[PDB]
């Protein structure tokens, strides 16, 4: 109806771009054959199950945009579009690459993401002008050796498929800079992967890799190496020191029991190292002695029972996550870690903290949730940069009076402890915003000085008896308690 007039409009305008997207089109009219001047046809977001043979009359088409339709194929007449440069077939119902697509040898850009494709035929070698090929989110089990004739490829995306291997002939696609293989079933990578010398983005997470080829050392433009969720427990001893632009290394969710063995400069370039969810039973002595730029270490969910003798020499570390290990002590040498801003120690077996904690002048966040802490050291008072202090689920009965010296503290989590009272010095926490006191069964009062925390907007007190406060006030909840402390206490300003 309106597409009749829009096709008609295009005819009289002689416009070389036709946009029929988002028009609920089920059947494309035959008359589209008349608009032979078109170089761009936009049919995306429609209801098309098929393109008519008349589309092959649009022999000047350079762009055919068909995403978000219900196509199963394309007309054999598309053969006649000898100038077609980009075909966009995302989000359709293709069970295979349409036969005609294998003859569109002028194509440089082919988008096939989100279909039902299982096989790439050997005839893929005909599309040797392709620089962008995306077949992400399909059902592909293997690629043909003839992928190696796509020598102009820059981006090859086959993420979210069923690949178990990659043909060694991928090593002939020497222009590739972005190769995404994540979320496949990959058991290995070919030793020829090193032939991809301009490789700068390699997607490998969520596969079944048990090793990395040593030839990957040749891909020295790589700026990230994310091996998350595989089956890796070692690395080629030469690999990391060859990746001289490597910024970040993720070994999370693998089966490392020991740090990978590497050169002296194995960690000399990365800023971030993520080894969370492995089986690592110790951190080697000296492992960060040449890691001047490494500032984030994540060791969460491993098997650590202690820390190396030179722990206190990690002077560049800024964020350290040792959550979900089996640490029983933090050594006094933690005083060495003068750059630390974030220290996460939740879910260990700590009973006390070293006095040396007080040397962490830049510490902003300290998370001690789910330990066995029985006290805090007085030297906590010197953490003047501390903003967030999480002590949830410990065995604390009192806090040091010096807790009130934490000028910058905004978040204080004391839920699930054994507290009998809060110090009056809580009132000098001028910046306190969130105070969690829930599930302290022996906490029977709150100090009037709590009224002095003018920025206090959240406090939890569920399952505290608070029997030294009036029953109806306690039943009113945090809002009523704070108002009561202000009105009955001695601190009203006027
Ligand atoms: Mg899958």
Swiss-Prot record:
GO MF annotation terms: protein phosphatase 1 binding; protein phosphatase binding; protein phosphatase regulator activity; volume-sensitive anion channel activity
Main location, first listed in the record: cytoplasm
Annotated consequence of substituting residue 416 to K: Impairs SMP complex formation
Effect the entry attributes to changing residue 47 to E: Impairs SMP complex formation
Outcome of substituting residue 88 to N: Abolishes SMP complex formation
Outcome of mutating residue 182 to H: Promotes SMP complex formation
LRR repeat locations: 14-35, 37-58, 60-82, 83-104, 106-127, 129-150, 152-173, 175-196, 198-220, 221-242, 245-266, 269-290, 293-313, 316-337, 339-361, 362-383, 385-407, 408-429, 431-453, 455-476
Keywords for this protein: Cytoplasm, Disease variant, Leucine-rich repeat, Nucleus, Repeat
Sections of the chain in a coiled coil: none
Documented effect of changing residue 370 to K: Impairs SMP complex formation. Impairs SMP complex formation
Gene Ontology CC entries for this record: cytoplasm; cytosol; nucleoplasm; nucleus; protein phosphatase type 1 complex
Disorder: Noonan syndrome-like disorder with loose anagen hair 1: A syndrome characterized by Noonan dysmorphic features such as macrocephaly, high forehead, hypertelorism, palpebral ptosis, low-set and posteriorly rotated ears, short and webbed neck, pectus anomalies, in association with pluckable, sparse, thin and slow-growing hair.
SUBUNIT field: Component of the SHOC2-MRAS-PP1c (SMP) complex consisting of SHOC2, GTP-bound M-Ras/MRAS and the catalytic subunit of protein phosphatase 1 (either PPP1CA, PPP1CB or PPP1CC). SHOC2 and PP1c preferably bind M-Ras/MRAS, but they also bind K-Ras/KRAS, N-Ras/NRAS and H-Ras/HRAS; these interactions are GTP-dependent and both SHOC2 and PP1c are required to form a stable complex. Interacts with PP1c in the absence of Ras GTPases. Interacts with M-Ras/MRAS and RAF1. Interacts with ERBIN; disrupts the interaction with RAF1 and Ras, preventing the activation of the Ras signaling pathway.
Biological role: Core component of the SHOC2-MRAS-PP1c (SMP) holophosphatase complex that regulates activation of the MAPK pathway. Acts as a scaffolding protein in the SMP complex. The SMP complex specifically dephosphorylates the inhibitory phosphorylation at 'Ser-259' of RAF1 kinase, 'Ser-365' of BRAF kinase and 'Ser-214' of ARAF kinase, stimulating their kinase activities. The SMP complex enhances the dephosphorylation activity and substrate specificity of PP1c.
Family: Belongs to the SHOC2 family.
Name of the protein in its database record: Leucine-rich repeat protein SHOC-2
UniProt organism field: Homo sapiens
């Amino acid at each position: 109806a309106e597409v009749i007039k829009e096709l008609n409009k295009c005819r009289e305008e002689n416009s070389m771009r036709l946009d029929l997207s988002k028009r609920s089109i089920h059947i494309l009219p035959s008359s589209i054959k008349e608009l032979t001047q078109l170089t761009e046809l936009y049919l995306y977001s429609n209801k098309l199950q098929s393109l008519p043979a008349e589309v092959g009359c649009l022999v000047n088409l350079m762009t055919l945009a068909l995403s978000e339709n219900s196509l199963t194929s394309l007309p054999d007449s598309l053969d006649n579009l000898k100038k077609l440069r980009m075909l966009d077939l995302r989000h359709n119902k293709l069970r295979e690459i349409p036969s005609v697509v294998y003859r569109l040898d002028s194509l440089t850009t082919l988008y096939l993401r989100f279909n039902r494709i299982t096989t790439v035929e050997k005839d893929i070698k005909n599309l040797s002008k392709l620089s962008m090929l995306s077949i992400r989110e399909n059902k592909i089990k293997q690629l043909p050796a003839e992928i190696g004739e796509l020598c102009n490829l820059i981006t090859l995306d086959v993420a979210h498929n069923q690949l178990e291997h990659l043909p060694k002939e991928i090593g002939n696609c020497t222009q590739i800079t972005n190769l995404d293989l994540q979320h496949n079933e990959l058991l290995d990578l070919p030793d020829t992967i090193g032939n991809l010398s301009s490789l700068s983005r390699l997607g490998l997470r969520y596969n079944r890799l048990s090793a990395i080829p040593r030839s990957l050392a040749k891909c020295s433009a790589l700026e990230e190496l994310n091996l998350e969720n595989n089956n890796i427990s070692t690395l080629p001893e030469s690999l990391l020191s060859s990746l001289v632009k490597l910024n970040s290394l993720t070994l999370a969710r693998n089966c490392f029991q020991l740090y990978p063995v590497g050169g002296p400069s194995q960690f000399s370039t990365i800023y971030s190292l993520n080894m969370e969810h492995n089986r690592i039973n110790k951190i080697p002595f000296g492992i960060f002695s040449r890691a001047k730029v490494l500032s984030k270490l994540n060791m969460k969910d491993n098997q650590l029972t202690s820390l190396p003798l030179d722990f206190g020499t990690w002077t560049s570390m800024v964020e350290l996550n040792l959550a979900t290990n089996q640490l029983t002590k933090i050594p006094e040498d933690v005083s060495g870690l003068v750059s630390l801003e974030v220290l996460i120690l939740s879910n260990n077996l700590l009973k006390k903290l070293p006095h040396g904690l007080g040397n962490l002048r830049k510490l902003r966040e300290l998370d001690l949730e789910e330990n066995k802490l029985e006290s805090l050291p007085n030297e906590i008072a010197y953490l003047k940069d501390l903003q967030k202090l999480v002590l949830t689920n410990n065995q604390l009965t009192t806090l040091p009076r010096g807790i009130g010296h934490l000028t910058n503290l905004t978040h204080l989590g004391l839920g699930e402890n054994l507290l009998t009272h809060l110090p009056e010095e809580i009132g000098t926490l001028e910046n306190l915003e969130e105070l969690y006191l829930n599930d302290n069964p022996n906490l029977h009062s709150l100090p009037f000085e709590l009224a002095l925390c003018s920025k206090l907007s959240i406090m939890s007190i569920e399952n505290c008896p608070l029997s030294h406060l009036p029953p109806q006030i306690v039943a009113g909840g945090p809002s009523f308690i704070i108002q009561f402390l202000k009105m009955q206490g001695p601190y009203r300003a006027m």
